[PDB]
Amino acid sequence: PAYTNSFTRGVYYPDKVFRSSVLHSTQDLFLPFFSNVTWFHAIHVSNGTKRFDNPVLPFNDGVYFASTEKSNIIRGWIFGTTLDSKTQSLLIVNNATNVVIKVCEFQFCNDPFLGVYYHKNNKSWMESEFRVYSSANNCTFEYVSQPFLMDKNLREFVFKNIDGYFKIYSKHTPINLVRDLPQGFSALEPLVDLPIGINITRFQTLLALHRSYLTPGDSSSGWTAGAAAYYVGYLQPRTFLLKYNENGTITDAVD
Amino acid sequence: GAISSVLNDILSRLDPPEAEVQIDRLITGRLQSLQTYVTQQLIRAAEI
Amino acid sequence: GAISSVLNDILSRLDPPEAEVQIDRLITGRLQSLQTYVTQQLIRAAEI
Amino acid sequence: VSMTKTSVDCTMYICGDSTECSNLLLQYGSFCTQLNRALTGIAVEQDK
Amino acid sequence: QVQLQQPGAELVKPGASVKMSCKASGYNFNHYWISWVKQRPGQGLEWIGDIYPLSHFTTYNEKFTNRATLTVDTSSTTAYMQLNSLTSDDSAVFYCARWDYFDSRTFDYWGQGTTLTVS
Amino acid sequence: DILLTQFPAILSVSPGERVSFSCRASQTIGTNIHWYQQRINGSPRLLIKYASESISGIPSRFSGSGSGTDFSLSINNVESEDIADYYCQQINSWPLTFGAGTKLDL
Amino acid sequence: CALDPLSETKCTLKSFTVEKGIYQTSNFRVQPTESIVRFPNITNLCPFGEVFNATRFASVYAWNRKRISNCVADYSVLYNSASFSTFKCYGVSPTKLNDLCFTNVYADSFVIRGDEVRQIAPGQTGKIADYNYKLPDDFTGCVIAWNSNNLDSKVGGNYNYLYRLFRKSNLKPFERDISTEIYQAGSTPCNGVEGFNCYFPLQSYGFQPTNGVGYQPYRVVVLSFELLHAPATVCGPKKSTNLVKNKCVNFNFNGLTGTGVLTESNKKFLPFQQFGRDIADTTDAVRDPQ
Ligand SMILES: *[C@@H]1O[C@H](CO)[C@@H](O)[C@H](O)[C@H]1NC(C)=O
Ligand SMILES: *[C@@H]1O[C@H](CO)[C@@H](O)[C@H](O)[C@H]1NC(C)=O
Ligand SMILES: *[C@@H]1O[C@H](CO)[C@@H](O)[C@H](O)[C@H]1NC(C)=O
Ligand SMILES: *[C@@H]1O[C@H](CO)[C@@H](O)[C@H](O)[C@H]1NC(C)=O
């Protein structure tokens, strides 16, 4: 796993209060400036041979997540303390049509995946099935809205679990960088708060499977599952000095 | 020490018997702030 | 903030455990009064 | 030779339009009057 | 076996009270709620109220919160409702079902149905 | 106050087919629906408890599914004794409410 | 002191004779012309019946939390009703709840006993607090409890109600566990249902109709209000008046209960933020709820 340095990335809006032309200092779980964030290559295809890597990642304090997938190979995320032994788990699934957030207790296998096929008549890749979980058990929450993971492009997410509530921040920005996070600054807007009182200490990602891979054989033809580059960083208790411009946007920050 | 630094958020959201203690905390803090500012201004005025 | 501004009145009509809080309020107020007076006197004495 | 001739409204600073806060400030004595008098003295001193 | 006895086809003048009889046997009377349902001929079931025989706690429907008053006789294990001002519209079938509380709340046993009519 | 409605107020069925009903509640209740049947000049009888599992003495054709707000009643096979009035009852909180009414036709 | 400015000067100086000069007597403030109240266009009543009128309450170990939002909440009827024996509000005032607006209200319902009703409070130590239900230290909201002896007590005991008796570690606030894993203690010799120094985590208790008041079942509902930092969805039953600008008014924007003159703003609020503060942490810009 590559170890890329996150420069001027991982800063969100501390609160839902409009501030303009004011330098505001806030103490909250933040991604440290110029911190070492682990880079994972989810899938690399070389002859029908693919390198699949979706390891479990500890959810200590917050977690900063960024993806550069042009084809949206990375879709949704899995949370939960152990994902077994009748323990509560948290799941997000993102299909093309709409974001189907399914926050339900689940039993997960080692390999997480979703199904999608190609219709020759419509010339589109519409989802075939939902082959993520065996069944829905004691599902407490569910949310559907416009999908955020779609609409080359960098998608930054911060997940935080304090006082039971699950906080998710997001901001989408197209980037021309290829191998490293761009040396620019973006602020993550609060997206949605999840009111589920569960334990989250490990983390995992979910990848798309087109009709090419949906075949039981390992060899896949016709679909390029190579645009998989997601970076993971762990938040820390930090104090940040936030610069608000006259428009209210956080232009810069100081750790 | 008060529940909120906004005076109106204490006048509302609380009954007068229970709001008065928070108002007293805010009043003590702000009066100390003015006393500090006025002492600094008096010393600065002596220097000027 | 005390019930009365007279120390003897607070000493009466109140048990010591409940009179002590009012005495503390009076003591804090009067100590602030002396500190303000002494600071003003020091500044005025510097001017003089 | 002089500095900015600022003035502070003690009642408007400690309290906004609130009247309960104004009454609780009233029971604290004449601290606001002393602060306003000191600031006015500073102002007249700057003019002098 | 469990059987709930409920006489029906009672004739009462409008504007007078009725004393429904709901005799139940075959189960422990203190471990199960018993309820009443009003059904117009050719119309859906309408809730009336519930009761706790052990503590004599009752809940009434909003429409029947004042007209229908419910009482229970623990000695005879028979529930009653009385002191109501009947009208011509009140002509309907009055059931008496046993509510399976403390467990799957299912209305396990139903009565034959008291087909009260007025004229 | 929870309110229940059935879109198929009257339904016509043929012997041996599969049909499904509907019962949506005003507020989410989490599997607190009991489906009842009332034959002509008869008394209501419990069929499916908590809208998911069934009880003894009921034919396996009566199958219930649904959770949250929208609930359904499914019957595998239709015979002569399946023509009755099927009612949806919510039991989550007082006041208890019954369905508007569903009728079966041959 | 208000007859004429000379008399105001005489009052300020505490003398009936004033000398030549200019005297700072008092302050001039434009009094508000009218009172403005602006609440969102929500009209439907909140489903508080489904929380309090519930047939059975969930156990303490696995309670039920309900999302009360996008509705008008009337807490006056809740407070005025004498059914609830304990109605304690911590961060708010029970009589001021109708004038406020909240972004989200969550009701947690569970059944406890009279000896453990005091454990439902911020900063409390006890069996329920440590192992079953912990309230945050900065808890703002109300705690509602009433006797359920007439509701849940049964002859021979009611065994549908469970409280955890043993846990490895204390619970953080608003933490629910449904593992039901067997408790291992001592030298850790228990890997099955029963073992040495081993017990079942869920200790059931039966409520008797003639049991003591301290052991009687108590139905508890706690409303966890989170105050106004985001746009409001649940509000009190306050009528909304017409918006008026360029006039000093006592505006009440979702319970902000400020005072000032309102003007059109060119500042672009982000969708997730509804208030605009300043250096002194006073509301400078607001977004109209309607
Ligand atoms: C989550 O993991 C275990 C239980 O699954 C626990 O020991 C740990 O403290 C928990 N961490 C939290 C709640 O942050
Ligand atoms: C602020 O917004 C204005 C338009 O209202 C725009 O012209 C200007 O470039 C913006 N400045 C920044 C720093 O975003
Ligand atoms: C609970 O039921 C009673 C009786 O119907 C009713 O008066 C009360 O208002 C209900 N509770 C709430 C919170 O509405
Ligand atoms: C009614 O509510 C809608 C939804 O927010 C709002 O756009 C509209 O302005 C409201 N009506 C009035 C008269 O303000």
Q: Domain of A21? A: 3-255
Q: What CA–CA distance (Å, rounded) separates C44 from D37?
A: 14
G126: its two tokens: 């006890």
Residue whose structure tokens are 């059109």: G264
Q: What CA–CA distance (Å, rounded) separates E2 from E34?
A: 13
- D10 reaches B (C-beta below 8 A): yes
In three-state form (DSSP H/G/I as H, E/B as E, the rest C), the secondary structure along F7-42 is CCCEEECCCCCCEECCEEECCCCCCCEEEEEECCCC
G58: its two tokens: 């969930």
**CATH no. for residue A79?**
2.60.120.960
Do the strands A202-209 and A74-80 form a parallel or antiparallel pair, or are they unpaired? antiparallel
Q: In the sheet where A17-18 sits, what is the strand order?
A: A17-18, G275-276, G285-286
- Resolution in angstrom units: 2.8
Q: Which residues contact G228 (CB under 8 A, 6 or more apart)?
A: G100, G101, G102, G103, G254, G255, G256, G274, G275
- B47 reaches D (C-beta below 8 A): no
Long-range CB pairs of D42-46, under 8 A, 24+ apart, other chains included: D42/B41, D42/B42, D42/B45, D42/D5, D43/D5, D43/D7, D45/B45, D46/B45, D46/B48, D46/D2, D46/D3, D46/D5
* Chain D residues touching residue G27 (CB < 8 angstroms): 9, 11-12
Q: What CA–CA distance (Å, rounded) separates A5 from A228?
A: 18
Backbone angles phi, psi at E26, to 5 degrees: 100, 0
Concatenate the DSSP letters of all residues of A6-48 into one string.
Answer: E-S--EE-SSSEE--S-EEEEEEEEPPTTEEEEEE--EEE---
D contact chains, 3+ CB pairs < 8 A:
B, C, G
CA A241 to chain centre: 26
Report whether F61 contacts F47 (CB < 8 A). no
Report whether G153 contacts E55 (CB < 8 A). yes
In three-state form (DSSP H/G/I as H, E/B as E, the rest C), the secondary structure along A212-237 is HHHCCCCCCCCCCCCCCCEEEEECEE
Residue G50: CB atoms within 10 Å? 22
Report whether F49 contacts F57 (CB < 8 A). no
Q: Which residues contact F81 (CB under 8 A, 6 or more apart)?
A: F39
Return the ligand number nearest the Cα of G290.
4
Report whether A77 contacts A207 (CB < 8 A). no
A22: its two tokens: 């004011």
Report whether A137 contacts A104 (CB < 8 A). yes
Backbone angles phi, psi at E58, to 5 degrees: -125, 145
Exposed/middle/buried for G97, CB within 10 Å: 0-12, 13-18, 19+?
Answer: buried
Q: What CA–CA distance (Å, rounded) separates G70 from G76?
A: 18
**Which of G93, G281, G282 shows the shortest C-beta gap to B13?**
G93
CB distance A61 to ligand 1 below 6 Å: no
Could you tell me the maximum CA-CA distance found in chain C, to the nearest angstrom? 48
For residue C7, how many C-alpha atoms fall within 13 Å in the half-sphere facing its CB? 6
Best of B32, B42, B44, B47 to substitute, by most chain C Cβ atoms within 10 angstroms, is: B42
In three-state form (DSSP H/G/I as H, E/B as E, the rest C), the secondary structure along chain B is CCCCCCHHHHHCCCCHHHHHHHHHHHHHHHHHHHHHHHHHHHHHHHHC
Q: Is the dihedral of CA A91, A97, A98, A99 positive or negative?
A: positive
**Terminal C-alpha separation, chain F:** 35
Please report, as a single letter, which amino acid is at residue G83.
S
How do the domains of chain E map onto residue ranges?
3-118
A contact chains, 3+ CB pairs < 8 A:
G
CB distance A26 to ligand 1 below 6 Å: no
Going from the C-alpha of E74 to that of each of A194, E22, E29, the distances in angstroms are 50, 12, 8
Q: Which residues pair with A3 in a beta bridge?
A: A38
Backbone angles phi, psi at G142, to 5 degrees: -130, 150
Q: What CA–CA distance (Å, rounded) separates G265 from E102?
A: 59
Q: Residue of the nearest CA to atom 1 in ligand 4? A: G41
Q: Which residues contact A120 (CB under 8 A, 6 or more apart)?
A: none
Q: What CA–CA distance (Å, rounded) separates E100 from A7?
A: 64
Q: What CA–CA distance (Å, rounded) separates G128 from G132?
A: 5
Q: What CA–CA distance (Å, rounded) separates E84 from E66?
A: 8
Do the strands G285-286 and G275-276 form a parallel or antiparallel pair, or are they unpaired? antiparallel
For residue G183, how many C-alpha atoms fall within 13 Å in the half-sphere facing its CB? 16
Q: Which residues contact A166 (CB under 8 A, 6 or more apart)?
A: A90, A159, A160, A193, A194, A195, A196, A200
Q: What CA–CA distance (Å, rounded) separates B29 from B31?
A: 6
Length of chain A: 255
Q: Which residues of F27-63 are buried (b: 16+ CB within 10 A; e: fewer)?
A: bbbeebbbbbbbeeeebbbbbbbbbeebeeeeeeebb
Backbone angles phi, psi at G53, to 5 degrees: -80, 15
Residue whose structure tokens are 């009672």: E10
Nearest chain E residue to F85 by CA distance is: E44
- E62 reaches G (C-beta below 8 A): no
Do the strands A187-194 and F23-25 form a parallel or antiparallel pair, or are they unpaired? unpaired
Give D1 to chain G, closest Cα distance, Å: 23
Q: Which residues pair with E61 in a beta bridge?
A: none
Report whether A187 contacts A11 (CB < 8 A). yes
Where does F4-104 sit in CATH, by number?
Answer: 2.60.40.10
Q: What CA–CA distance (Å, rounded) separates C19 from F86?
A: 74
Backbone angles phi, psi at B29, to 5 degrees: -60, -45
C-alpha closest to that of F25 among F64, F86, F68, F66? F68
C-alpha closest to that of G143 among G222, G58, G47? G222
Residue A62: CB atoms within 10 Å? 24
Report whether E97 contacts E34 (CB < 8 A). yes
Q: Is the dihedral of CA A29, A33, A37, A42 positive or negative?
A: positive
At F53 the three-state DSSP class reads strand
Q: What CA–CA distance (Å, rounded) separates F106 from F86?
A: 15
Inter-chain residue contact F94 with G47, CB threshold 8 Å: no
Report whether A28 contacts A253 (CB < 8 A). no
* Helical (H) or strand (E) element with E57: strand E57-60
C-alpha closest to that of E24 among E76, E100, E69? E76
Exposed/middle/buried for G151, CB within 10 Å: 0-12, 13-18, 19+?
Answer: buried
Inter-chain residue contact F98 with E107, CB threshold 8 Å: no
Backbone angles phi, psi at G128, to 5 degrees: -65, -45
Residue whose structure tokens are 């609130």: D18
Concatenate the DSSP letters of all residues of chain A into one string.
Answer: -EEEEE-S--EE-SSSEE--S-EEEEEEEEPPTTEEEEEE--EEE----EEE----EE--S-EEEEE--SS--EEEEEEESSS-TT--EEEEEE-SSSEEE--B-----SS-EEEEEEETTTTEEEE----S-S---SB---EEES-SS---EEEEEEEEEETTEEEEEEEEEE---SSS--S---EEEEEEEE-------EEEEEEEE-HHHHSSSS---S-------EEEEE-EEEEEEEEE-TTS-EEEEE-
Concatenate the DSSP letters of all residues of E25-53 into one string.
Answer: ESS-TTSSEEEEEEE-TTS-EEEEEEEET
Do the strands G142-147 and G86-89 form a parallel or antiparallel pair, or are they unpaired? antiparallel
* Helical (H) or strand (E) element with D14: helix D10-14
- C47 reaches B (C-beta below 8 A): yes
Best of G75, G90, G92 to substitute, by most chain B Cβ atoms within 10 angstroms, is: G92
Q: What CA–CA distance (Å, rounded) separates B29 from D15?
A: 12
F68: its two tokens: 């949250």
C-alpha closest to that of C5 among C23, C21, C32? C23
Report whether A2 contacts A44 (CB < 8 A). no
Report whether G35 contacts G249 (CB < 8 A). yes
Q: Which residues pair with F32 in a beta bridge?
A: none
Backbone angles phi, psi at G207, to 5 degrees: -100, 120
Report whether G53 contacts F93 (CB < 8 A). yes
- G50 reaches F (C-beta below 8 A): yes
Query: What does the angle CA A255 – CA B6 – CA B8 come to, to the nearest 5 degrees?
Result: 155
Q: Which residues contact C13 (CB under 8 A, 6 or more apart)?
A: none
In three-state form (DSSP H/G/I as H, E/B as E, the rest C), the secondary structure along chain G is CCCCHHHHHHHHHCCCCCCCCCCCCCCCCCCCCEEEEECCCCCCECCCHHHHCECCCCCCCCCEEEEECCEECCHHHHHHCCCCCEEEECCCCHHHHHHCEECEEEEEEEEEEHHHHHHCCCCCCCHHHHHHCCCCCCCCCEEEEEECHHHHCCCCCCCCCEEECCCCCCCCCCCCCCCCCCEECCCCCCCCCCCCCEECCEEECCCCCCCCHHHCEEEEEEEEEECCCCCCCEECCCCCCCCCCCCEEEEEECCCCCCEECCCCCCCCCCCCCEECCCCCCCCEECCCC
Q: Which residues pair with E71 in a beta bridge?
A: E80
Q: What CA–CA distance (Å, rounded) separates F21 from A165?
A: 38
G contact chains, 3+ CB pairs < 8 A:
A, B, D, E, F
Q: Which residues pair with E23 in a beta bridge?
A: E5, E78
E3-118: CATH architecture: Sandwich (2.60)
Q: In the sheet where G260-261 sits, what is the strand order?
A: G34-38, G248-253, G260-261
At D48 the three-state DSSP class reads coil
* Helical (H) or strand (E) element with C11: helix C7-11
